[PDB]
Design a protein around this ligand. Structure first.
Ligand SMILES: Nc1nc2c(c(=O)[nH]1)N[C@@H](/C(S)=C(/S)[C@H](O)COP(=O)(O)OP(=O)(O)OC[C@H]1O[C@@H](n3cnc4c(=O)[nH]c(N)nc43)[C@H](O)[C@@H]1O)C=N2
Ligand SMILES: Nc1nc2c(c(=O)[nH]1)N[C@H]1C(S)=C(S)[C@@H](COP(=O)(O)OP(=O)(O)OC[C@H]3O[C@@H](n4cnc5c(=O)[nH]c(N)nc54)[C@H](O)[C@@H]3O)O[C@H]1N2
Ligand code: SF4
Ligand code: SF4
Ligand code: SF4
Ligand code: SF4
Ligand code: F3S
Ligand SMILES: O=S([O-])[O-]
Ligand SMILES: O=S([O-])[O-]
Ligand SMILES: [Mo]
Ligand code: NA
Ligand SMILES: [Zn+2]
Lengths: 894, 329
């Protein structure tokens, strides 16, 4: 036998850990984890999930495994819990009441198809739009509605900038959509600055690399107004005033330039800091100013080896010998140039000095290198002592941080929402990129300016585009969602136009075609498809949206696994298959591997996968287009006669992609980063990408971006062909940011607390906010935090109801008093669902939508509109509110 | 009670725990989804300083005093937290007006005081303390039970409450000073951490180890001289048990936090003292903490100089199988 005395009874627990099927799962949410999981079924019921822990390790550094998090291990609760959409639902009461009638798929989809055909016929196809964000999260489900929109002419949305995740300053500097090292590379750094980044809560499966780096001898700095959870492990904590980081950064740059701790060689080669600026007009000296038929887009540096001015190679006016195709994530395809192209060679560009030069028209003008201008402005305005006054960080601290940062090799900056979600985050990121340029660590392992926010990066992006926009992105309507929301929700930003003429800039950017305005001819938006994103709940200017934008929409359709707040406020709600009931890919910027989910069981109740829903809808649209004698129509914008009677075939390439798996394989097949990989391989184990974006993807080495420019010396896709810190466009001069410098936060809200709205460990955006187990590991509802120093004089006690408000709206939420919070601000974990434990409003009630003019510039080299490449950030960290105790309910503690 | 043949041993690296509660969730989703188990967190993670779970458990009583069994209190249900419940169906699908409030009115919960800690800005301080059954070499629960329902497994030292033998006496709840047996009021039986013995029997790490996202948990048999738990507890000696003065000889150990910033003085400049007070760590782990921190800081300093440190490499755990019994399943 061989049994211990109680082993028979112990079979009771052994039975609890058993299953008869194990499938691969993923959580298709916007967390950036893309964590490999197994899902465990017994008798056709999913019991639980567990990380599969099977990403291949790299030598000498910690593995990514297990990843996972606290939401992910209860992911199955959205299969079986009280939130699930089982059947198609049609509204019967007012929007938001949660008064429904169950309908058949047929009646639901026909109502929708009827409206869609009418809207195209009676108004314009661009009065229909589909919002579905972060394609990297679930590219097949993303492609379903975007392809639908593609073939009927409906417009799409932007997400990266709308969320404020788009590193606007990085695009301004580097001319790329964005790029960042995978998190394993953090282990290669000697000195990391966590700059508005709370990875203990907001990069949970990657956070181990930081504490492991430190135990391996790295030092880490946290910069954050409050003492945040990440901060308990760092070696040094810097707590500036909210939104004053730019002054800190510029003072660091000053110390580094003054004490000469920079990499002059790197500056001379990789940046525009040697380029020459006309003293008279304060513009770049250009070829056109010197030579008949000279280019507007070529420039000069002073070569100190020959005492003569020289035209640097690689700028916008310099064409490669054979052009490449346009690349989505670059200003222009500078990969077409050969290796070595911008190598410094024997050149020695001057960084300091003044020089005279002979203009075309006979005049002689004085020119200076950008660096010379930059340097003199920093010595005058950006001393430690002056930045000390602004930030409230001591001058000694600022100086010691500068020296450490510039001395440790490699050093890196890790920035996040704390520094990216501000009105002026663009100039702040340019300053962080200035700090990286000065230290020379860009494109090195363990170095650089690395941003992390949402699940924005689908490395296989050409395969995605192949499936979503088969006739080309140039034959696809896009709005820019921040502008769309600002205008259609008729937002009041409270910025007086004599301070910043937002209206003029915005209008002028649209009428000159720099930025889009959808619908055209001022028509109202009429039909709104929302899925894979909780658009209403997360939307800035929410109160304007609900009051002004929402009632313009004749039909609002939400496709969802659960009843979120957007769906609660919708006309038709369609049931979408859970992550563990569908097939899809799942990728992120944090690691270089392809994740996926597959069905553990068939879709529950009457749910369908997103791919199938837009397939079935396409049929009913065919049927409706015929009923309405409107089967084809002209679309003069694209010179495209559209055939609504063939929509389904269009959706599926004549039936080839009628199954989810073929659509998923289609993406994998049509991208260099993935071609070779099959679904069956992914089903077994996560596979590493075959290549990446702006650097080689090397065997056994963590990805770090921009090496194609830094190492291979291809030109940067900017106007100057370098990392460009001088942006001599009229709008940048207007805002005082032709150069990186400190821009103080917007104080248009005349209220005394700065309103912070960071991301919590307890949810993934609005998803899992309402999960019972998550709420049980908090205090049962949303939370806003205050320092005791502000709460005590307001007579506010821990867990009292508090009321926070400004001109935009009001929210009433229970308070958490936390000594780590900095006085003068309050922190409300972002976007709890509207139906949760709030007596009124939510976090977005007190947020307008605001647009910085520099984000509207679209006629300046690498600055042009492309969806999710450039456009207005949806910032929100400038918001200010008042707070008082709510006295309608004051329960006693015990 | 006769020594076990091998003793399963855990090491919790407080330098690495990010308080993400994944292990709390993994454990609950495996073993405490049953009737009457909703208020039970066999594995929990609490902010230190704080009240913990159940609140004020550290003065609940129990354990041993000069080898005499102590009979402590039975924590009332409110000290554990009445698990909040919600009527989502009413508001989302049934047209009922009004917010989906938690019931009861929130007053207490297992993680109520998350990240509050102690000290005034800019020297507020806290860290995370994961806890569980300590599968003690001298289990007070086991001795307390008038029905011998609790036994320590001979093959791996895992302590288990035999659910057929249990008659709900609650002497165990009284006498465990870590307050880790939970009286199930539906079944009239105590329930507690089972050391994931079915996983351990198949050579799979307990879920609170295998699923530890911060990569802070180690597990193994302490007799295995090549295990990270042997290395941290016996060789380098940087892993201590929680409240040794309770006299139960826990077999779960903690590496105390040495990561962390300095006390900030009124002029804005660093002290040499850490924000985490030594006195706090001494309260949890006793007078050996000082020397452990000294070793840890010393070894990290070698790493900063670019020198070798085997100890640091162990904590870093570049491969999970160097920390634990295989986590694959
Ligand atoms: N004041 C302030 N405002 C801010 C922010 C702030 O920091 N402060 N942060 C931002 C940021 S940075 C972001 S990235 C947004 O919160 C992201 O919201 P999102 O709607 O995409 O996620 P969310 O999780 O909420 O919604 C995802 C929806 O999709 C459902 N879902 C998830 N998976 C699927 C699926 O496979 N198919 C379908 N059809 N649906 C699915 C999900 O239930 C939820 O409704 C935004 N505003
Ligand atoms: N568990 C979980 N993780 C997530 C998400 C989630 O919803 N849940 N969302 C993901 C996504 S899409 C986002 S965009 C990211 C956001 O996550 P993060 O990038 O970390 O940004 P935040 O949470 O907004 O704030 C990070 C820290 O910066 C601080 N900080 C706030 N204001 C300032 C400032 O003015 N200056 C400085 N130096 N610091 C400031 C905040 O108080 C906060 O402590 O998280 C991603 N990770
Ligand atoms: S939710 Fe996001 S982070 Fe948490 S486990 Fe699933 S994928 Fe990983
Ligand atoms: S999972 Fe690991 S890291 Fe997260 S809380 Fe539990 S122990 Fe700490
Ligand atoms: S911790 Fe409490 S329950 Fe677990 S063994 Fe030690 S005494 Fe018994
Ligand atoms: S060992 Fe197993 S049972 Fe005990 S706490 Fe960890 S997961 Fe829960
Ligand atoms: S004392 Fe014994 S009888 Fe049950 S309640 Fe505790 S195991
Ligand atoms: O799926 S269970 O944990 O209710
Ligand atoms: O204030 S009470 O409800 O903790
Ligand atoms: Mo985001
Ligand atoms: Na739930
Ligand atoms: Zn569950």
């Amino acid at each position: 036998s061989g049994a211990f005395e109680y082993s028979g009874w112990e079979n009771f627990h052994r039975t609890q850990w058993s299953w008869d099927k194990k499938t691969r799962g993923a959580h298709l949410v916007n967390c950036t984890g893309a964590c490999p999981h197994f899902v465990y079924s017994k008798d056709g019921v999913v019991m639980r999930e567990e990380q599969s822990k099977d990403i291949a390790p790299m030598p000498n550094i910690p593995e990514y495994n297990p990843r996972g998090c606290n939401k992910g291990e209860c992911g199955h609760d959205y299969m079986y819990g009280p939130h699930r959409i089982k059947y198609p639902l049609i509204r019967v009461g007012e929007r938001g009441e949660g008064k429904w009638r169950r309908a058949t798929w047929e009646e639901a989809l026909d109502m929708i198809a009827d409206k869609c055909v009418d809207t195209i016929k009676n108004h314009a196809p661009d009065c229909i739009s589909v919002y579905s964000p972060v394609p990297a999260v679930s590219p097949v489900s993303f492609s379903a509605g975007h392809r639908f929109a593609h073939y009927i002419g409906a417009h799409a949305h932007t997400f990266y900038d709308w969320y404020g995740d788009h590193p606007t300053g990085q695009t301004q500097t580097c001319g790329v959509q964005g790029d960042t090292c995978e998190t394993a590379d953090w282990f290669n750094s000697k000195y990391i600055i966590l700059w508005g980044s709370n990875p203990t809560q907001t990069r949970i499966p990657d956070a181990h690399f930081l504490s492991e780096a430190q135990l391996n001898g790295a030092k880490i700095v946290s910069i954050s107004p409050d003492y945040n959870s990440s901060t308990i492990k760092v070696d040094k904590w810097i707590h500036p005033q909210p939104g004053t980081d730019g002054a800190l950064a510029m003072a660091m740059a000053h110390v580094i330039i003054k004490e000469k701790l920079y990499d002059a060689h790197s500056l001379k080669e990789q940046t525009d800091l040697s380029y020459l600026v006309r003293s008279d007009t304060k513009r770049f000296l250009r070829e056109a100013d010197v030579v008949a038929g000279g280019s507007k887009d070529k420039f000069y540096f002073w070569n100190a080896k020959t005492g003569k001015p020289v035209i640097p190679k690689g700028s916008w006016g310099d064409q490669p010998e054979k052009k490449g195709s346009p690349v989505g994530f670059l200003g222009r395809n500078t990969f077409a140039f050969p290796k070595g192209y911008i190598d410094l060679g024997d050149l020695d560009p001057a960084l300091e000095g003044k020089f005279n030069m002979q203009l075309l028209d006979g005049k002689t003008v004085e020119v200076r290198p950008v660096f010379e201008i930059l340097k003199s402005r920093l010595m005058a305005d950006n001393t430690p002592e002056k930045a000390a006054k602004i930030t409230g960080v001591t001058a000694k601290a600022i100086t010691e941080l500068a020296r450490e940062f510039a001395t440790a090799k490699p050093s890196m900056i890790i920035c996040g929402g704390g520094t990216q979600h501000w009105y002026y985050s663009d100039v702040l990121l340019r300053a962080m990129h200035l700090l990286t340029a000065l230290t020379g660590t860009e494109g090195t392992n363990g170095g650089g300016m690395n941003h992390y926010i949402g699940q924005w990066k689908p490395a296989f992006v050409a395969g995605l585009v192949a499936l979503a926009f088969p006739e080309g992105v140039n034959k696809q309507r896009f709005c820019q969602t921040t502008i769309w929301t600002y205008i259609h929700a008729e937002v009041n930003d409270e910025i007086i136009s004599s301070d910043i003429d937002t209206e003029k800039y915005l209008r002028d950017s649209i009428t000159t075609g720099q930025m889009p305005n959808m619908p055209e001819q001022g028509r109202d938006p009429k039909v709104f498809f929302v899925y894979r994103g909780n658009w209403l709940n997360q939307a800035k200017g929410q109160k304007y949206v609900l009051e002004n934008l929402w009632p313009k929409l004749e039909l609002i359709v939400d496709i969802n696994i659960r009843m979120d707040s957007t769906a609660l406020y919708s006309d038709v709600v369609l049931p979408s298959a859970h992550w563990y009931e569908k097939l899809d890919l799942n990728v992120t910027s944090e690691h270089s591997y392809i994740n996926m989910t597959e069905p553990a069981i068939k879709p529950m109740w009457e749910s369908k996968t997103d791919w199938q829903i837009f397939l079935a809808l396409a049929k009913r649209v065919e049927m409706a287009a015929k009923r309405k004698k409107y089967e084809k129509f002209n679309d003069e914008k694209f010179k495209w006669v559209r055939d609504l009677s063939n929509l389904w075939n269009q959706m599926t390439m004549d039936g080839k992609l009628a199954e989810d798996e073929a659509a998923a394989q289609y993406i994998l097949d049509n991208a260099p980063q993935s071609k070779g990989i099959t679904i069956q391989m992914l089903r077994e184990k996560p596979q590493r990408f075959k290549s990446n974006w702006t650097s080689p993807l090397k065997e056994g080495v963590p990805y770090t971006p921009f090496q194609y420019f830094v190492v291979d010396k291809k030109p940067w896709p900017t106007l100057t062909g370098r990392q460009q810190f001088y942006l001599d466009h009229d709008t940048f001069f207007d805002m005082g940011v032709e150069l990186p410098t400190y821009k103080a936060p917007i104080d248009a809200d005349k209220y005394p607390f700065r309103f912070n709205s960071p991301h919590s460990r307890h949810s993934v955006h609005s998803t899992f906010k309402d999960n019972v187990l998550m709420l049980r590991l908090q205090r049962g509802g949303p939370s806003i935090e205050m320092s005791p120093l502000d709460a005590k004089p307001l007579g506010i006690k821990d867990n009292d109801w508090v009321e926070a408000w400004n001109n935009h709206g009001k929210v009433i939420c229970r308070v958490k008093i936390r000594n780590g919070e900095q006085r003068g601000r309050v922190s409300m974990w972002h976007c709890p669902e509207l139906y949760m434990d709030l007596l009124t409003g939510g976090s977005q009630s007190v947020c307008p939508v605001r647009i910085n003019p520099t984000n509207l510039v679209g006629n300046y080299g690498h600055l042009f509109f492309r969806p999710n490449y450039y456009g207005p950030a949806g910032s929100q960290r400038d918001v200010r509110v008042n707070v008082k105790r709510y006295i309608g309910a004051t329960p006693i503690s015990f | 009670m006769k020594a076990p043949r091998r003793q399963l041993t855990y090491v919790t690296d407080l330098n690495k725990c990010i308080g993400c509660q994944t292990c709390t969730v993994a454990c609950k989703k495996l073993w405490t989804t049953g009737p009457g188990q909703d208020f039970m967190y066999w594995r929990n993670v609490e902010t230190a300083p704080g009240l913990g779970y159940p609140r004020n458990w550290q003065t609940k009583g129990g354990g041993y005093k000069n080898g005499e069994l102590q009979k402590g209190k039975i924590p009332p249900m409110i000290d554990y937290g009445i698990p909040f419940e919600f009527d989502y169906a009413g508001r989302l699908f049934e047209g009922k007006p009004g917010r989906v409030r938690p019931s009861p009115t929130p007053r207490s919960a297992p993680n109520w005081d998350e990240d509050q800690g102690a000290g005034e800005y800019p020297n507020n301080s806290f860290f995370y303390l994961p806890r569980m059954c300590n599968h003690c070499t001298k289990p007070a629960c086991l001795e307390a039970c008038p029905n011998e329902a609790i036994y320590k497994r001979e093959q791996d030292g895992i302590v288990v409450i035999h659910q057929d033998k249990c008659k709900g006496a609650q002497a165990c709840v009284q006498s465990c000073p870590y307050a880790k047996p939970y009286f199930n009021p539906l079944t009239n039986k105590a329930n507690k951490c089972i050391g994931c013995f079915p996983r351990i029997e198949q050579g799979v790490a307990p879920a609170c180890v295998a699923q530890c996202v911060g990569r802070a948990m180690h597990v193994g048999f302490v007799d295995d001289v090549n295990s990270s738990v042997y290395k941290l507890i016996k060789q380098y000696k940087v892993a201590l048990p929680l409240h040794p003065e309770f006299g139960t000889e826990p077999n779960v150990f903690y590496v105390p936090p040495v990561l962390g910033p300095r006390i900030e003085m009124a002029n804005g400049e660093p002290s040499t003292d850490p924000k985490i007070p030594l006195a706090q760590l001494e309260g949890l782990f006793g007078k050996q903490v000082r020397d452990v921190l000294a070793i840890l800081q010393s070894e990290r300093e070698k790493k900063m100089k670019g020198l070798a440190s085997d100890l640091m490499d162990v904590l870093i755990g570049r491969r999970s199988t160097d920390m634990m019994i295989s986590p694959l399943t």
